[PDB]
Amino acid sequence: MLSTGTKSLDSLLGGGFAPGVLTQVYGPYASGKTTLALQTGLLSGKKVAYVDTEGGFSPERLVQMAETRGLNPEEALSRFILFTPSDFKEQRRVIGSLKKTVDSNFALVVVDSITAHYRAEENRSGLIAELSRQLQVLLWIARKHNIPVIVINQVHFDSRTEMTKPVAEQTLGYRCKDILRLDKLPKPGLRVAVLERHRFRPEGLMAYFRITERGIEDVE
């Protein structure tokens, strides 16, 4: 398991993110999903392939996080191999490229994210297979290197049964064996993660944490 650097999140997850599987981490902005990604990558100590289509990655934030934990920010920042497909086109190309870019030097892959394009109506029909293309390539990458692939997305949309509770789009949903929902508590920086889906850890369980200058910490 790839530790989150948080006692609660690790307890909830059986130790950290699982190698060889896609863990979806979804929630609203500032929910702490990106910080979680940054922290897991930072503490792994090896390279992190980070596909940032949403511009959610912040060098300064990682530097802050690295320093505040006495880690040497230059090396930390250097371990983050970035990809900025951003206009959601070279995205699949980037993920495809990842097949050969990712080697045994990598400890983690992070995709952020893939779920908002110009032609709005898109969402239903067609494109859905292209998403499956990507997810499959990511699962392939995760399995060949036995490392975790964190898939970050925004909350509320893909669970159209009726009670969109809350995001899990069928096969695409089951594409991710582990699923963590991050919610905001009404106190500055206060959050809770809910393990909605996991392979062996009890589901529905939660872990409270707070977003601080050091990244993400266990609550007081």
From Swiss-Prot:
InterPro entries: DNA_recomb/repair_Rad51_C, DNA_repair_and_recomb_RadB, P-loop_NTPase, RecA_ATP-bd. Gene3D superfamilies: P-loop containing nucleotide triphosphate hydrolases (3.40.50.300). It comes from the Archaea. Keywords: ATP-binding, DNA damage, DNA recombination, DNA-binding, Nucleotide-binding. The keyword Nucleotide-binding applies. ATP binds at residues 27-34. The keyword NAD does not apply. GO terms for biological process: DNA recombination; DNA repair. The gene is radB. The lineage of its organism: Archaea, Methanobacteriati, Methanobacteriota, Thermococci, Thermococcales. HAMAP family: RadB (MF_00350). Belongs to the eukaryotic RecA-like protein family. RadB subfamily. This is DNA repair and recombination protein RadB. Involved in DNA repair and in homologous recombination. May regulate the cleavage reactions of the branch-structured DNA. Has a very weak ATPase activity that is not stimulated by DNA. Binds DNA but does not promote DNA strands exchange. One of its GO terms (molecular function) is damaged DNA binding.
